[PDB]
Amino acid sequence: IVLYYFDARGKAELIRLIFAYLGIEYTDKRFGVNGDAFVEFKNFKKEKDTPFEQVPILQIGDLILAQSQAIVRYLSKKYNICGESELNEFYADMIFCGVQDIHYKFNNTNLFKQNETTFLNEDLPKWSGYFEKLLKKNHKYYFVGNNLTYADLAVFNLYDDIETKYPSSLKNFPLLKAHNEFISNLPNIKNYITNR
Amino acid sequence: IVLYYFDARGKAELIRLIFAYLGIEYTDKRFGVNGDAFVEFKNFKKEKDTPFEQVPILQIGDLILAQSQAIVRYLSKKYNICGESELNEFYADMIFCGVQDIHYKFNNTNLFKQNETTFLNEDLPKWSGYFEKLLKKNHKYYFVGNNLTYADLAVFNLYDDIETKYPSSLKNFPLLKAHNEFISNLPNIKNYITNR
Missing domain, CATH: 1.20.1050.10 (Glutathione S-transferase Yfyf (Class Pi); Chain A, domain 2)
Structure with a gap:
């Protein structure tokens, strides 16, 4: 499980709290921790087929989930919260x-x-x-x-x-x-x- | 001369540049350099009669000037720029x-x-x-x-x-x-x- 977002809370913190609460592990990939954020972002959009060219993107396997709101409702139904x-x-x-x-x-x-x-x-x-x-x-x-x-x-x-x-x-x-x-x-x- | 504003660039930085270009010494009062920025601001609104309760306000003598844009135009006429x-x-x-x-x-x-x-x-x-x-x-x-x-x-x-x-x-x-x-x-x- 990989979560892609900028190195910030924003619309991705709620997903990170869900993963923490439930205790399920994952890779928290944050753009711009070291490099330029927008270049790292600009290059992620190439290597990855995003629906609306915007993050967060939660990758479970070869599956790409987009739209924070939609993502939390999904995780929430699957894990009973x-x-x-x-x-x-x-x-x-x-x-x-x-x-x-x-x-x-x-x-x-x-x-x-x-x-x-x-x-x-x-x-x-x-x-x-x-x-x-x-x-x-x-x-x-x-x-x-x-x-x-x-x-x-x-x-x-x-x-x-x-x-x-x-x-x-x-x-x-x-x-x-x-x-x-x-x-x-x-x-x-x-x-x-x-x-x- | 006293310029009031938060400890930030915002809409006050242009006025500070005008004063620098013209080499005019004034006091740069920045809310928050001490306590809760909002505390000083809230007290500021009590001691000073502001037209719209917004900063920056520029105090020349006993008169207070209030809208950043109107202030720059004012200063600009007065100093030929x-x-x-x-x-x-x-x-x-x-x-x-x-x-x-x-x-x-x-x-x-x-x-x-x-x-x-x-x-x-x-x-x-x-x-x-x-x-x-x-x-x-x-x-x-x-x-x-x-x-x-x-x-x-x-x-x-x-x-x-x-x-x-x-x-x-x-x-x-x-x-x-x-x-x-x-x-x-x-x-x-x-x-x-x-x-x-």
């Missing part, structure tokens, strides 16, 4: 789609755009509230059902990425803060985090 | 506007958005093209007149900035390239640059 019912499969999928929304906003805010304030003070809190509510409904902390699913990992990864840029706003959201801390303490993810 | 005729003052302005459009596109391209290769392949070459044609119409040192204007500093800032994230494609644009080395060598500029 997508929920145990029609309905719950849907709810996980639903919150995951929610995570993409705000995660994008996040990656679309920066100094030059003078965008940082309205995100930090408006979009971020609003959305953290949406997640609290979902935790409140399902009331050890899981978003869906009674066992862990990729939605729990995606939410976690979301805030973990946000905090690398901005201060930890989770003070006002106790359940979201707890959930975040809980999955970060899971022995398997905890080891990965420390080795990053 | 805005051109020496109506048409030329207009051209500098036009070139400057074009620089903003692509400078924004640049600061709006990241790994997550999978914006990058399309910027380097479609956008950048198309724009470098326009600037080459422009310098051609003025036949290897200036965009407007026989003298230096803020348009020149704006185009050089632009590429010096792009060059800290992406390659250096100026090869296929000879006048653009000569233009940028030309101003990168101006005594005052080479000095500021080496001390950044």
Whole structure:
């Protein structure tokens, strides 16, 4: 199993957390660890037939899987972390789609755009509230059902990425803060985090 | 004179170049050199009355100036580098506007958005093209007149900035390239640059 992406988190960290959580081994190929990233990328697209000329690409054998979102749903169904019912499969999928929304906003805010304030003070809190509510409904902390699913990992990864840029706003959201801390303490993810 | 902004280039670097080219000493207040950049900024918005709560703001005496573009045009008139005729003052302005459009596109391209290769392949070459044609119409040192204007500093800032994230494609644009080395060598500029 080989994962191809740039030497960064971005859209590939969630897949790496899945592999870690589940503990399945693989080769983490990162473009630009030493060389120029774009040349390494430009040359990967030659030697490899990609659907949409974009990474991440997860290679299992001679099989090429593309599109991060599609890749995690696949891994999740195959390894039972997508929920145990029609309905719950849907709810996980639903919150995951929610995570993409705000995660994008996040990656679309920066100094030059003078965008940082309205995100930090408006979009971020609003959305953290949406997640609290979902935790409140399902009331050890899981978003869906009674066992862990990729939605729990995606939410976690979301805030973990946000905090690398901005201060930890989770003070006002106790359940979201707890959930975040809980999955970060899971022995398997905890080891990965420390080795990053 | 006090220039306020975050400890970054962003939209304040052009103003810092103007001050360097003209050898004007001022104070470069950079939020974050001490504590939470957002803390100082938040306190800054309390002590100073900003029109739109955005930085940079330039404080000359007791008056505060607020919009980076409006500030550069202001400084340029006051120090004669805005051109020496109506048409030329207009051209500098036009070139400057074009620089903003692509400078924004640049600061709006990241790994997550999978914006990058399309910027380097479609956008950048198309724009470098326009600037080459422009310098051609003025036949290897200036965009407007026989003298230096803020348009020149704006185009050089632009590429010096792009060059800290992406390659250096100026090869296929000879006048653009000569233009940028030309101003990168101006005594005052080479000095500021080496001390950044």
